[PDB]
Amino acid sequence: ATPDFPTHFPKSSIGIENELAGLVVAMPANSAQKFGYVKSAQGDALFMLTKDMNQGSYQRPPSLQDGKNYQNWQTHTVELVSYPCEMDDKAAVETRKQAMLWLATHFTTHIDQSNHQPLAPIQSEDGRFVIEITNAKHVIAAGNGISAESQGQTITMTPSGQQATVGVAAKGFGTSATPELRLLESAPWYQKSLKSQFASLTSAENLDDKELAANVFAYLTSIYLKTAELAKKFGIYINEWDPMSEQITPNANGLTDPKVKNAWEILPRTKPSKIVEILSKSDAKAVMKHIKPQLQSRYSESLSKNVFQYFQDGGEVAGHGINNATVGDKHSPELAILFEFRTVPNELQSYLPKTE
Numbered sequence: 001a002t003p004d005f006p007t008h009f010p011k012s013s014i015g016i017e018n019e020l021a022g023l024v025v026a027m028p029a030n031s032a033q034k035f036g037y038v039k040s041a042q043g044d045a046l047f048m049l050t051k052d053m054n055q056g057s058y059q060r061p062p063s064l065q066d067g068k069n070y071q072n073w074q075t076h077t078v079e080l081v082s083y084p085c086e087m088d089d090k091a092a093v094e095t096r097k098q099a100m101l102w103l104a105t106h107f108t109t110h111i112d113q114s115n116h117q118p119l120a121p122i123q124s125e126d127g128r129f130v131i132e133i134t135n136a137k138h139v140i141a142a143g144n145g146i147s148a149e150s151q152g153q154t155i156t157m158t159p160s161g162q163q164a165t166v167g168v169a170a171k172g173f174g175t176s177a178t179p180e181l182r183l184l185e186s187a188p189w190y191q192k193s194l195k196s197q198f199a200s201l202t203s204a205e206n207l208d209d210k211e212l213a214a215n216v217f218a219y220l221t222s223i224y225l226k227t228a229e230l231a232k233k234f235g236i237y238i239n240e241w242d243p244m245s246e247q248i249t250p251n252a253n254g255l256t257d258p259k260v261k262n263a264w265e266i267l268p269r270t271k272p273s274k275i276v277e278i279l280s281k282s283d284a285k286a287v288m289k290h291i292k293p294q295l296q297s298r299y300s301e302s303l304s305k306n307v308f309q310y311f312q313d314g315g316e317v318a319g320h321g322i323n324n325a326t327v328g329d330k331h332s333p334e335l336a337i338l339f340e341f342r343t344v345p346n347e348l349q350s351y352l353p354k355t356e
């Protein structure tokens with residue numbers, strides 16, 4: 001079994017996604033995404049071997065008929081998904097990059113002499129890396145996996161197949177305290193002006209933590225307003241809001257549509273309603289009560305009510321979120337909120353492996 005991602009980190013964390021070029025993985029239909037992982041010889045889990053983009057049904061090349069059942073098997077692109085590490089852990093970042101580059105070299109040999117065969121659980125020549133196979137019911141094939149023989153491809157990785165996910169303590173969003181926080185706050189959807197706006201709206205209120213409440217308000221409002229902007233732009237059906245009722249033609253399949261996720265640039269990966277937990281019951285009520293008018297002053301009553309309710313009931317920004325991540329003291333853990341960089345920016349390029 002592929003180990004689950006560690007959930008706790010002392011400070012800011014980072015994870016990477018690396019979609020490979022030059023090969024496919026074929027597996028039975030409705031197989032689990034994870035088919036293996038790469039760890040250090042010391043035992044530290046570095047990245048998962050996963051199926052990503054469905055490339056159509058698998059057809060075993062006739063010249064490689066082996067008496068085995070490949071019925072209903074699907075081909076997919078391979079994506080290497082790192083186990084998160086600390087952002088300032090140079091060794092862990094580098095080991096992940098080096099392990100991903102080594103596996104690409106291993107994959108290059110694999111498609112040359114073992115095309116249309118599963119990957120074997122092996123140790124690297126230098127002893128540094130170990131492949132563990134969690135699902136042997138797979139095959140690795142060159143290119144798009146139609147031909148029995150390869151075109152002599154070198155397995156590569158490119159910025160277009162790359163993503164990064166940054167996890168920070170939820171209490172820090174809006175403080176600009178660290179370079180990671182400042183990078184996350186640069187998100188085009190984040191409106192820092194909402195912090196001082198909340199302070200102006202709550203002068204007569206005796207809040208338990210005024211600065212924290214303002215930070216949570218600015219974060220949540222920014223997400224709610226962006227969700228409403230996207231629902232209007234892309235014609236998305238949110239809760240009970242119908243875009244067609246406002247003469248908007250849908251041009252996206254929902255919140256999880258790649259182009260909707262790309263429109264965020266820095267995509268929130270955690271359930272918005274989780275942040276309410278970092279505040280007192282009183283402060284959370286004060287924050288929540290002030291959000292509705294921010295939506296209603298910019299958007300229709302129906303869109304406003306539907307966006308507000310969706311996130312209030314635990315609605316996700318773009319599908320299943322990473323909602324069990326924590327930061328700080330292991331014994332008294334604090335909520336971590338995660339963000340996916342749809343394109344890896346210059347500030348995070350050093351966390352990504354490069355073929356060239």
Ligand SMILES: Nc1ncnc2c1ncn2[C@@H]1O[C@H](COP(=O)(O)OP(=O)(O)OP(=O)(O)O)[C@@H](O)[C@H]1O
Pocket residue numbers: 005006007008013014015016017081082083084085164165166167322325326336338
């Ligand atoms: N606690 C954490 N802190 C930081 N990063 C994390 C944490 N937990 C997971 N991640 C990272 O978040 C990313 C999540 O990858 P995941 O495969 O789960 O999403 P996905 O389904 O692949 O998204 P996509 O549909 O775009 O491929 C990984 O890069 C992982 O390393």
Ligand SMILES: [Mn+2]
Pocket residue numbers: 017163340
């Ligand atoms: Mn991703």
